[PDB]
Short mmCIF file of C-alpha atoms in Angstrom, two decimals:
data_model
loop_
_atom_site.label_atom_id
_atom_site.label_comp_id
_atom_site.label_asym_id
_atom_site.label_seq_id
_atom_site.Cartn_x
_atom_site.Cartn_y
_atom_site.Cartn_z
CA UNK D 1 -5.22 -8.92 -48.91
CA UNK D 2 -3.72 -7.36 -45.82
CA UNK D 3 -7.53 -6.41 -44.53
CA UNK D 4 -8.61 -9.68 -44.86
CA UNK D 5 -5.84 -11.35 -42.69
CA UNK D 6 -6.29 -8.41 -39.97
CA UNK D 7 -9.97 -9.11 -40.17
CA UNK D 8 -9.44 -12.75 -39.84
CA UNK D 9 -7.21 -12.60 -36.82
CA UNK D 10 -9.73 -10.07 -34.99
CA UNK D 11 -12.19 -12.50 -35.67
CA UNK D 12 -10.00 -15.28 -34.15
CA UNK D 13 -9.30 -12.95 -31.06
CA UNK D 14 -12.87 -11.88 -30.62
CA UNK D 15 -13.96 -15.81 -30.31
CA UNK D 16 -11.10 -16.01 -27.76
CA UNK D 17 -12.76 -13.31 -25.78
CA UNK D 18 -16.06 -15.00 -26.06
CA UNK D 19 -14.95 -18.19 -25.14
CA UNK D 20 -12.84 -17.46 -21.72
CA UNK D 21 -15.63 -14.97 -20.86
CA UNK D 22 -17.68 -17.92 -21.00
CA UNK D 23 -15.90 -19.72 -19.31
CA UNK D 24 -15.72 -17.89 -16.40
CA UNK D 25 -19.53 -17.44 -16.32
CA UNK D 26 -20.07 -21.40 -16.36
CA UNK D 27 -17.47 -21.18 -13.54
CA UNK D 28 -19.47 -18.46 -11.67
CA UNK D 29 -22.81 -20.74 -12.58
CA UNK D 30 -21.35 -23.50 -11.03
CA UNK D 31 -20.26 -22.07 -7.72
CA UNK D 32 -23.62 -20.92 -7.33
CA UNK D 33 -25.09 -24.53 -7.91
CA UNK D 34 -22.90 -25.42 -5.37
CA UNK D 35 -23.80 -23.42 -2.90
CA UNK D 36 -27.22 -24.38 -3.78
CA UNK D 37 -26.42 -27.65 -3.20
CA UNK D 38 -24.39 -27.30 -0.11
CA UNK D 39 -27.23 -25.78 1.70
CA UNK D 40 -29.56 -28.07 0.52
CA UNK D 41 -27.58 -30.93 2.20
CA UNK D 42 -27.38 -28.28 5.49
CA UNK D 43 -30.92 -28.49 5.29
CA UNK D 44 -31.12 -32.33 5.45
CA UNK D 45 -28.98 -32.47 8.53
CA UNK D 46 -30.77 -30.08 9.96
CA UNK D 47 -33.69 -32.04 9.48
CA UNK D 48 -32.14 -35.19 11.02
CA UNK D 49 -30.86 -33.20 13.99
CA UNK D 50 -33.94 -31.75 15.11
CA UNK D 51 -35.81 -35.19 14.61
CA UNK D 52 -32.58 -36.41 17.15
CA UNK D 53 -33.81 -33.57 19.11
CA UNK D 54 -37.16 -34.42 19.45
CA UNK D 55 -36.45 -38.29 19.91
CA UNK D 56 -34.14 -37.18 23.23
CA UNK D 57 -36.51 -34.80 24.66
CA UNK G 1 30.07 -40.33 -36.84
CA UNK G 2 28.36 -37.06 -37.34
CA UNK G 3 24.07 -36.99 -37.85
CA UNK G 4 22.32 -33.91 -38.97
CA UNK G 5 18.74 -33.54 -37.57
CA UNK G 6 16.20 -32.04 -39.62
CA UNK G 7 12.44 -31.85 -40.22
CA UNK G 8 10.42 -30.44 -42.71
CA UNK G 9 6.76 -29.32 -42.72
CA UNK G 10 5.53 -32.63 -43.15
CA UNK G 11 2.54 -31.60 -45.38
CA UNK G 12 2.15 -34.94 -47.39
CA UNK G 13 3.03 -38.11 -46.15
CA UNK G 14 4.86 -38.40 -50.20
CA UNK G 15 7.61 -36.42 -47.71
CA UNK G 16 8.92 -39.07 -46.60
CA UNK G 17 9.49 -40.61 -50.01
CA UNK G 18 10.44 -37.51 -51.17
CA UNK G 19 12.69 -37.14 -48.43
CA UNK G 20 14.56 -40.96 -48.42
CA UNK G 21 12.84 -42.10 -51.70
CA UNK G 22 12.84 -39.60 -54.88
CA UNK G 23 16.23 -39.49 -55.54
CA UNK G 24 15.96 -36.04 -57.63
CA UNK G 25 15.19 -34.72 -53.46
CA UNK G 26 16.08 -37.57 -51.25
CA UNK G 27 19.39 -36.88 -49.46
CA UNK G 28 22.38 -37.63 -51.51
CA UNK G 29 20.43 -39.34 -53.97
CA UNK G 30 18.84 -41.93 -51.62
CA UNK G 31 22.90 -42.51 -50.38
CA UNK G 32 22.55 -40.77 -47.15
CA UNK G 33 20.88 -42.59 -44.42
CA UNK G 34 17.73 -40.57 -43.60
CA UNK G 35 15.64 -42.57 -40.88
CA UNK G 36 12.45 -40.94 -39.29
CA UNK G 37 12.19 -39.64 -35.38
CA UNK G 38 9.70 -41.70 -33.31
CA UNK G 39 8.59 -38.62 -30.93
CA UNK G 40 5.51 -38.92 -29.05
CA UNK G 41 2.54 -36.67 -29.64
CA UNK G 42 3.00 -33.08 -27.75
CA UNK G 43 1.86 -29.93 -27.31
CA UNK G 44 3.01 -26.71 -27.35
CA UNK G 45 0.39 -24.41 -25.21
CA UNK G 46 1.12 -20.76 -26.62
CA UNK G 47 3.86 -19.05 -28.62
CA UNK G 48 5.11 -17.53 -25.85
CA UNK G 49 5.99 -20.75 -24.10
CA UNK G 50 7.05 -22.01 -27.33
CA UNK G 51 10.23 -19.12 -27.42
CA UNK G 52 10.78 -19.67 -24.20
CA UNK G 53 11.06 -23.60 -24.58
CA UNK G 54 13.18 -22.60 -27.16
CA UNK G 55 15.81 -20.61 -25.56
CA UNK G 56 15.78 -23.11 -22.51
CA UNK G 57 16.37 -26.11 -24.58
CA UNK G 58 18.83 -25.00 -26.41
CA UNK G 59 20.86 -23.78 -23.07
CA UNK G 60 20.12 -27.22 -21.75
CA UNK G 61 21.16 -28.66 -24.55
CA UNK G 62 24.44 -27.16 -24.63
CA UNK G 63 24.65 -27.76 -20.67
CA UNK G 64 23.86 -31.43 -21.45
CA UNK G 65 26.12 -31.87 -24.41
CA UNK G 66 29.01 -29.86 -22.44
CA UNK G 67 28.10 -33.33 -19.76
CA UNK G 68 28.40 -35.81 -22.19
CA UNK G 69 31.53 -34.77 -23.31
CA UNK G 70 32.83 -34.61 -19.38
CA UNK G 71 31.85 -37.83 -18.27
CA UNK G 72 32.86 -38.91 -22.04
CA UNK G 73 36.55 -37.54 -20.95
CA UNK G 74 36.52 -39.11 -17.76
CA UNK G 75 36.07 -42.01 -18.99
CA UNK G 76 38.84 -41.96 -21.31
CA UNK G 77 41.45 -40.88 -18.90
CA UNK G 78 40.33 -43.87 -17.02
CA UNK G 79 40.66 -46.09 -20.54
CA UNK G 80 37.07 -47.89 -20.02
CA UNK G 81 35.41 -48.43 -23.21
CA UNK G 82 36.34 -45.52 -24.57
CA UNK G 83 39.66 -43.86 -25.82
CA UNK G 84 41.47 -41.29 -27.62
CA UNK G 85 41.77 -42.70 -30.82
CA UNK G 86 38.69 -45.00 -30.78
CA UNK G 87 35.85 -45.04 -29.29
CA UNK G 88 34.80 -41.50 -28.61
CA UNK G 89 31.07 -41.17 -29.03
CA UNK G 90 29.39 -42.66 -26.42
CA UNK G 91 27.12 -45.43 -26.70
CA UNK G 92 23.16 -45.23 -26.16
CA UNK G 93 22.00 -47.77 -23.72
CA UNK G 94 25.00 -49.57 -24.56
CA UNK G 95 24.97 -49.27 -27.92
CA UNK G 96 25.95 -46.78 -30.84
CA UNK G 97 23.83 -43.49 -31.96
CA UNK G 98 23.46 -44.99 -35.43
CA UNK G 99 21.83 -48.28 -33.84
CA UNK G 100 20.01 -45.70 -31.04
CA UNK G 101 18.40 -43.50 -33.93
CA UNK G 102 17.93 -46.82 -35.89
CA UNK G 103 15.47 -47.01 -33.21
CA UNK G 104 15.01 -44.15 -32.13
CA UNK G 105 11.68 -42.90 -29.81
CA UNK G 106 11.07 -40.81 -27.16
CA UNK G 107 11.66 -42.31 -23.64
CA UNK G 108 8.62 -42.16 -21.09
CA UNK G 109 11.73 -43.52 -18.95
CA UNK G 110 13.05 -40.06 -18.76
CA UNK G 111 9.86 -38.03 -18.36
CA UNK G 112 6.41 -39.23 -19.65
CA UNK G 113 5.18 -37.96 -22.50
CA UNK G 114 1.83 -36.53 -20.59
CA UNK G 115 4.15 -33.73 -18.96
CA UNK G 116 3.56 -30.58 -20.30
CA UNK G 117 6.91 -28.76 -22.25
CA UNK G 118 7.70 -27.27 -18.87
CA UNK G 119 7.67 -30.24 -16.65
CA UNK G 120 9.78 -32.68 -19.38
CA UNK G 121 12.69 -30.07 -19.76
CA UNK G 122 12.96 -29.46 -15.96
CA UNK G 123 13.15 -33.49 -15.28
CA UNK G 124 15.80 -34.01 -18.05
CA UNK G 125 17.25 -31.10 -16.67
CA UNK G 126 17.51 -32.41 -13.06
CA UNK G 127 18.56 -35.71 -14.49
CA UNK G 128 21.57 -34.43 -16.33
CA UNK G 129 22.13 -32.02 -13.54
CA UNK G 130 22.18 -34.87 -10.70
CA UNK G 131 24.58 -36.94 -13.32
CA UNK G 132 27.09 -33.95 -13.73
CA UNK G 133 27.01 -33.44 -9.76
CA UNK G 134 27.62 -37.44 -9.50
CA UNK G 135 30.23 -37.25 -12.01
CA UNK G 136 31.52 -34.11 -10.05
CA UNK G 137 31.91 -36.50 -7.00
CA UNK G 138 33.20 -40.24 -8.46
CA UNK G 139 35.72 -38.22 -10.72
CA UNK G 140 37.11 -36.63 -7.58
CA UNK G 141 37.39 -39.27 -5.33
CA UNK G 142 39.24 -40.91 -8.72
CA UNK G 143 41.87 -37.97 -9.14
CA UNK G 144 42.30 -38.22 -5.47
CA UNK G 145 43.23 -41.77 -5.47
CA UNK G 146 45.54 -41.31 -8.58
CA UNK G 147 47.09 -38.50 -7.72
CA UNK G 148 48.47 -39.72 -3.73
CA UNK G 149 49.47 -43.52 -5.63
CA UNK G 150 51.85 -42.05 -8.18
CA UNK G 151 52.73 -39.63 -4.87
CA UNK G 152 53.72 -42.48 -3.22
CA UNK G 153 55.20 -44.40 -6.43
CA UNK G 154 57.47 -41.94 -6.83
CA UNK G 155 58.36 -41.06 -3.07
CA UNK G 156 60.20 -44.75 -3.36
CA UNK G 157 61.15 -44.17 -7.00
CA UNK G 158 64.32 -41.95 -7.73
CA UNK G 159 68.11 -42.00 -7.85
CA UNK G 160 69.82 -42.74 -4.43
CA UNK G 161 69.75 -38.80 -3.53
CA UNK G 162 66.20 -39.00 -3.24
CA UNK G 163 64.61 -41.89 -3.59
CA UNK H 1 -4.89 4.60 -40.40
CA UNK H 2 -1.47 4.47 -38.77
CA UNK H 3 1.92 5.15 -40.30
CA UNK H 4 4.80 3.61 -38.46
CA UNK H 5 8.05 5.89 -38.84
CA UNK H 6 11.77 3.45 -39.99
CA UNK H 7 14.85 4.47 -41.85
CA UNK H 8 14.46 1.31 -43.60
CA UNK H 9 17.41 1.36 -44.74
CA UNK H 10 17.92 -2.27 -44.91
CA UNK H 11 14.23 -3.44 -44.11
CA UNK H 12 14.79 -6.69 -46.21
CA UNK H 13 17.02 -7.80 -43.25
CA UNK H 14 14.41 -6.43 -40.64
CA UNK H 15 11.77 -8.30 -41.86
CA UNK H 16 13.98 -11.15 -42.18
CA UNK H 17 15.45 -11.08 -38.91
CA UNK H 18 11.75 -10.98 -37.83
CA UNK H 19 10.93 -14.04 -39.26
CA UNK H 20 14.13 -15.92 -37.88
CA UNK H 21 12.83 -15.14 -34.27
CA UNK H 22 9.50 -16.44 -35.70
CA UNK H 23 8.82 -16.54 -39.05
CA UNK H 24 5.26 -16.61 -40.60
CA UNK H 25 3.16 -16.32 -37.08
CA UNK H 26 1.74 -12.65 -37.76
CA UNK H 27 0.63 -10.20 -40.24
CA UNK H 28 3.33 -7.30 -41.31
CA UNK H 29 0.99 -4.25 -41.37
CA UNK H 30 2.86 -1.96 -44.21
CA UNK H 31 2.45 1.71 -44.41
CA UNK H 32 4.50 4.54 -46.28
CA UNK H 33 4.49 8.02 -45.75
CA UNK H 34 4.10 10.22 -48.56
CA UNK H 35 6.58 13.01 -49.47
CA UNK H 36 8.54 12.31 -45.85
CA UNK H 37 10.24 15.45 -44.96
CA UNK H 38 14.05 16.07 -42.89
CA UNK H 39 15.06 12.83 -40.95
CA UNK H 40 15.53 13.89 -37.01
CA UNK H 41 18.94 12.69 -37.38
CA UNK H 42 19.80 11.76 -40.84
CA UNK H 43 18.58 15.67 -41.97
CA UNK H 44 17.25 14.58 -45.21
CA UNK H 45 14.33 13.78 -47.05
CA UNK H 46 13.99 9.66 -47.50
CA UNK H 47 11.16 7.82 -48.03
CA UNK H 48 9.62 5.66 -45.47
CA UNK H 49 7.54 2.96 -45.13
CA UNK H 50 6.70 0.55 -41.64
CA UNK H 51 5.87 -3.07 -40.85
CA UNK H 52 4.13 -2.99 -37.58
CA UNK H 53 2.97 -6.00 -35.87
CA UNK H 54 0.91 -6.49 -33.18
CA UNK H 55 1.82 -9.52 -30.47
CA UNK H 56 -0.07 -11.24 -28.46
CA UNK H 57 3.08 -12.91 -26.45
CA UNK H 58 5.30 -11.12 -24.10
CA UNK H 59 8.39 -12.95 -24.98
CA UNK H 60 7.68 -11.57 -29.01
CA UNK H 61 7.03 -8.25 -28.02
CA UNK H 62 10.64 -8.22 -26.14
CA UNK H 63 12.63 -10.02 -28.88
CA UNK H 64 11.29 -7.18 -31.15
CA UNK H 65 11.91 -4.56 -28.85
CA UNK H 66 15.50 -5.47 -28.98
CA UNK H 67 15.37 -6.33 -32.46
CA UNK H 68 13.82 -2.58 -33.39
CA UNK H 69 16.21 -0.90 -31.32
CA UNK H 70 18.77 -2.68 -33.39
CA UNK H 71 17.31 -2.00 -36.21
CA UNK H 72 17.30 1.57 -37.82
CA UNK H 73 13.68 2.35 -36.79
CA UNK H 74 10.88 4.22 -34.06
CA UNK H 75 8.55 1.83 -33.47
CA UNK H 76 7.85 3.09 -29.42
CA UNK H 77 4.55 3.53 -28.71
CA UNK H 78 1.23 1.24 -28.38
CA UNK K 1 6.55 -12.86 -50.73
CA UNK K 2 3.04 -14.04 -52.48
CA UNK K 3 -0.24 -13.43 -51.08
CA UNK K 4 -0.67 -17.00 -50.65
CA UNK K 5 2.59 -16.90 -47.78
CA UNK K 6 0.43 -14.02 -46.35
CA UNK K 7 -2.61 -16.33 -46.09
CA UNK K 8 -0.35 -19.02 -44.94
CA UNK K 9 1.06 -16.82 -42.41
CA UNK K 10 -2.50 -15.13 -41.27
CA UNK K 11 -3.61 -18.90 -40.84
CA UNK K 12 -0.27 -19.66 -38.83
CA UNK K 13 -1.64 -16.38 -36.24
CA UNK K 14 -5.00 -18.07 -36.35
CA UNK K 15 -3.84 -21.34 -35.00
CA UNK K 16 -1.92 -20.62 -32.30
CA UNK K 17 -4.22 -17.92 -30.86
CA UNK K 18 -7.08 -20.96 -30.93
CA UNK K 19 -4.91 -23.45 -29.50
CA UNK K 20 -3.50 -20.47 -26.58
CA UNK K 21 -7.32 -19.80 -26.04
CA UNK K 22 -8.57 -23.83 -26.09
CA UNK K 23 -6.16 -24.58 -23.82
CA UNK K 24 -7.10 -21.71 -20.73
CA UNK K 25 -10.61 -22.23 -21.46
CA UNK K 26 -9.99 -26.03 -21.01
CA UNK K 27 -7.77 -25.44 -17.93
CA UNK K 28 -10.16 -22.79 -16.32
CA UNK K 29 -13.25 -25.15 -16.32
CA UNK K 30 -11.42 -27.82 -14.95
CA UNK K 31 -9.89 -25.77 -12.08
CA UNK K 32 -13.57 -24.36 -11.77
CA UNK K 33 -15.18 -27.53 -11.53
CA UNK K 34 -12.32 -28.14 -8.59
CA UNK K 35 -13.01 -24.72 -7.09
CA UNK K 36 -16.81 -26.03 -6.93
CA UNK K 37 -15.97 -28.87 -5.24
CA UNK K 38 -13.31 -27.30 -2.73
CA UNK K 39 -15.68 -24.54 -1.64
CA UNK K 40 -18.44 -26.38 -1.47
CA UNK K 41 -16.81 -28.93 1.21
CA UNK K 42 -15.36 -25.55 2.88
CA UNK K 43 -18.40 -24.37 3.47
CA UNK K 44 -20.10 -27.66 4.23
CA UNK K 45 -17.74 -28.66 6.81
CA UNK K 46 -17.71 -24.92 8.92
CA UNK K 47 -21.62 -24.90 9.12
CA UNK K 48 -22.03 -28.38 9.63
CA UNK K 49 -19.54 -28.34 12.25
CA UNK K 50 -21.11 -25.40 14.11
CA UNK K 51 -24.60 -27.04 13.85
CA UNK K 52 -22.99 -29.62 15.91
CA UNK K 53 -21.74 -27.41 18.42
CA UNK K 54 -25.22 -26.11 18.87
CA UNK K 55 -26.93 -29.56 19.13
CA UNK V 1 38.49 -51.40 -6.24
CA UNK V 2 36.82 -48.22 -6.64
CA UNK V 3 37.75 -48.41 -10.11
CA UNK V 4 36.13 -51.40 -11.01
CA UNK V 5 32.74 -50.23 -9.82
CA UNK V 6 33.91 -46.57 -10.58
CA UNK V 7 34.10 -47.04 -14.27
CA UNK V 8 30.70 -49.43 -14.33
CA UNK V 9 28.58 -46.87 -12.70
CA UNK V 10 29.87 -44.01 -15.26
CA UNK V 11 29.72 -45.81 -18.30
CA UNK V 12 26.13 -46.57 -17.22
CA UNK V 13 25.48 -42.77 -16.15
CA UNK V 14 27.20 -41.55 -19.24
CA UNK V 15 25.18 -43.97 -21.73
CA UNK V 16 21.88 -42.18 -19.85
CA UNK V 17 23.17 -39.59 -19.87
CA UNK V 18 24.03 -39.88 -23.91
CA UNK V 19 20.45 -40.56 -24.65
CA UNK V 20 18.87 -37.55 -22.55
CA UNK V 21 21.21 -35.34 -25.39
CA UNK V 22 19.34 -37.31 -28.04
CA UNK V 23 15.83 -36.93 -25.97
CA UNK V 24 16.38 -33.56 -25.05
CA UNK V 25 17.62 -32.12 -28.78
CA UNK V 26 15.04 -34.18 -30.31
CA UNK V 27 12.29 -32.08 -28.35
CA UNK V 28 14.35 -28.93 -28.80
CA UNK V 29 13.83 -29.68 -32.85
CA UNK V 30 9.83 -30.74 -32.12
CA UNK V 31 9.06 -27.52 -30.77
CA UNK V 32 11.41 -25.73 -33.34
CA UNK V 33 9.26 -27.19 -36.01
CA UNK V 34 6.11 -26.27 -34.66
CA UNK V 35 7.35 -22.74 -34.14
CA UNK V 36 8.81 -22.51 -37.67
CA UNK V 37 5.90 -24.16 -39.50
CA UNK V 38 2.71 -24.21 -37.16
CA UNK V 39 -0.25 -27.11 -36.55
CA UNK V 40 -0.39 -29.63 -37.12
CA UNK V 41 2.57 -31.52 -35.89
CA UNK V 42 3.64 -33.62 -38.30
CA UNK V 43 6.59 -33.01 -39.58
CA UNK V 44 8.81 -35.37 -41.88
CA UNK V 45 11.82 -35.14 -40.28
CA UNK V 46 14.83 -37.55 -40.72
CA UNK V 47 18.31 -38.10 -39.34
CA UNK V 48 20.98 -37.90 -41.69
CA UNK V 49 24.54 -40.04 -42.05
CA UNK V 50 25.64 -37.77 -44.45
CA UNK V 51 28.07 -39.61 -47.27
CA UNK V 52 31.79 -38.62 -47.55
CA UNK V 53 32.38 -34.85 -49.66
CA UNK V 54 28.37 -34.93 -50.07
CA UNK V 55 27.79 -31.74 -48.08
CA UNK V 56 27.48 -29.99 -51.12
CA UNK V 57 25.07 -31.95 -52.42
CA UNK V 58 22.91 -32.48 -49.68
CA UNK V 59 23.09 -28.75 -49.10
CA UNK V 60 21.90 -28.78 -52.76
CA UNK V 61 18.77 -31.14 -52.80
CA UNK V 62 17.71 -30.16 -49.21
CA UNK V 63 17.68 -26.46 -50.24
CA UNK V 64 15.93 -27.33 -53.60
CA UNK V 65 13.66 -29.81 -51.85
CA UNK V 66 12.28 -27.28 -49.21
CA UNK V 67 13.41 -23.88 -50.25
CA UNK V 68 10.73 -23.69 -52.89
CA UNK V 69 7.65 -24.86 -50.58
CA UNK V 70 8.25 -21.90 -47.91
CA UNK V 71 9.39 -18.96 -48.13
CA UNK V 72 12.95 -16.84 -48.45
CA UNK V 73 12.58 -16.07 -45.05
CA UNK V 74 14.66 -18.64 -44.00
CA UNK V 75 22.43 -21.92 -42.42
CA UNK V 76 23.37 -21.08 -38.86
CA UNK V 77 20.06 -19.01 -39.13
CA UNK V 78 18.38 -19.89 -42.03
CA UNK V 79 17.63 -23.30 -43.16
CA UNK V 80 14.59 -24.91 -44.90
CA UNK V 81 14.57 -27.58 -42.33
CA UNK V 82 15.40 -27.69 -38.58
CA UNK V 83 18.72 -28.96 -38.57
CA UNK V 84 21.20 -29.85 -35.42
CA UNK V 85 24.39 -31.67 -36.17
CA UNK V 86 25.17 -34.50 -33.44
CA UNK V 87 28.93 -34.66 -32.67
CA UNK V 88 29.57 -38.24 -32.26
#
């Protein structure tokens, strides 16, 4: 029975693995959406300063 | 009076009848007074924390029970509610261990029970710590004062060579 | 697959001292080797066998470091 | 001991391993989702501020 | 004077101080129980007033009552239960 318990505990270890590598991606996946986002709220106040811009020329 | 502390697995909830209630496995027959720990719900993060936890509690246990037993002698030089013959474990929010266990639960008073392992030990460490230093400092302003009144008691006591 | 080298002399106690640092958290791998020849130091023929257990946790891998240097046994590399 | 202690035992490594890895996944996602928010205002702040400058 | 307010203030820091050893061992057998039996966490653990010459017998019917659900792994080491005694 001792292959099945180091089989079982591999198993256990490999879902670890898959689970903090995941992790770390939806952490990775998430920095990029915010830097997606960032620059999309750059963009907006870009937008309002050049329409200031205009309005004082 | 002495208490021994013990838990077993737990695995059917017919423990704790077999524990206080079977008498062929309940302690001394169902004699013994057996009452249950109320201890909040906590986790242990990994093993390795857990032997750690371990080894630190049980050094700050010993560190606190060495306190106890300070302050606990203090006290009894000074003769306040406790004494050599009577009186020598100390009371539990004012009462006795047997009335504390009675009712006994873990106290968010201390540390709250959302603290991780780490964070409770280290405030009931720095609690007990603080105590022993304020013991430290109340026990030697009292030896201070003893000590120079019988100094000056006896300067004035004595036989007429000395006294 | 791998044969860890002991004296056992007393493994009982090994194993149970094991257990007392943490009993029942990992499988004890055993392996024997067949027909063992001259112990380094002993300078005899003994059989051996080895319980080898892998740890995740530092703090296990040092209490059995100092428990297997204790003990009669070569359990140093990975 | 019994091969049912063994079992008991191999399910006693199981658990602990899960709860070790539950626990650092939980506690990496939730310092991600604060990483998000901490360099996103970073970066917010430096650009926006320079815009400003410009303007 | 100072003993007056000397000896309140102790006996008030020594009670506290009294129940932190009963908070502090009674986490230091918690994580002792997870470690010796695993998840989950409950355990039935009691606190004992042992009866007069009973140490035997409790020895007896603890060791019976636990011994035969674990293992021979496991006194001052070995014990089917966690078990502290509490000097009081």
């Amino acid at each position: 029975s001792q292959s099945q318990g180091i089989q079982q505990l591999l198993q256990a270890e490999k879902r670890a693995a898959e689970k903090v590598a995941d992790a770390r991606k939806r952490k990775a996946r998430r920095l990029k959406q915010a830097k997606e986002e960032a620059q999309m709220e750059v963009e907006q106040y870009r937008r309002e300063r050049e329409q200031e811009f205009q309005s004082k020329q | 009076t002495e208490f021994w502390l013990i838990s077993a697995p737990g695995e059917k909830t017919c423990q704790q009848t077999w524990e206080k209630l079977h008498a062929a496995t309940t302690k001394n027959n169902n004699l013994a007074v057996s009452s249950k720990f109320n201890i909040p719900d906590l986790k242990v993060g990994t093993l390795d924390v857990l032997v750690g936890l371990s080894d630190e509690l049980a050094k700050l246990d010993a560190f606190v029970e060495g306190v106890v037993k300070k302050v606990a002698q203090y006290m009894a030089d000074v003769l306040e509610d406790s004494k050599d013959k009577v009186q020598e474990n100390l009371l539990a929010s004012g009462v006795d261990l047997v009335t504390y266990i009675t009712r006994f639960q873990w106290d968010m008073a201390k540390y709250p029970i959302k603290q991780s392992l780490k964070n409770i030990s280290e405030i009931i460490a720095k609690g007990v710590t603080q105590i022993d230093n304020d013991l430290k400092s109340r026990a030697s302003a009292y030896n201070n004062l003893k000590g120079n009144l019988q100094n000056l008691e006896r300067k004035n006591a004595g036989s007429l060579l000395t006294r | 697959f791998v044969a860890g080298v002991i004296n056992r002399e007393r493994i009982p106690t090994f194993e149970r001292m094991l257990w007392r640092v943490c009993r029942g958290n990992v499988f004890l791998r055993q392996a024997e080797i067949e027909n063992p020849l001259e112990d380094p130091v002993t300078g005899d023929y003994v059989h051996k066998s080895v319980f080898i257990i892998f740890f995740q946790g530092d703090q296990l891998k040092n209490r059995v470091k100092k428990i297997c240097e204790g003990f009669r046994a070569s359990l140093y590399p990975c | 001991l019994s091969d049912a202690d063994v079992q008991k035992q191999i399910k006693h490594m199981m658990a602990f391993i899960e709860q070790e890895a539950n626990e650092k996944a939980e506690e990496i996602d939730a310092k991600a989702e604060e990483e998000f928010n901490i360099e996103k205002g970073r970066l917010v702040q430096t650009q926006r501020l320079k815009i400003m400058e410009y303007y | 004077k100072q003993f007056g307010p000397l000896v309140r203030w102790l006996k008030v820091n020594f009670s506290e101080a009294f129940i932190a050893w009963i908070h502090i061992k009674a986490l230091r057998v918690f994580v002792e129980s997870v470690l010796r039996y695993g998840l989950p966490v409950n355990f039935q653990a009691m606190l004992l007033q042992p009866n007069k010459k009973s140490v035997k017998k409790l020895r007896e019917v603890l060791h019976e009552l636990y011994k035969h659900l674990d293992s021979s792994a496991a006194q001052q080491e070995y014990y089917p239960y966690v078990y502290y005694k509490i000097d009081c």
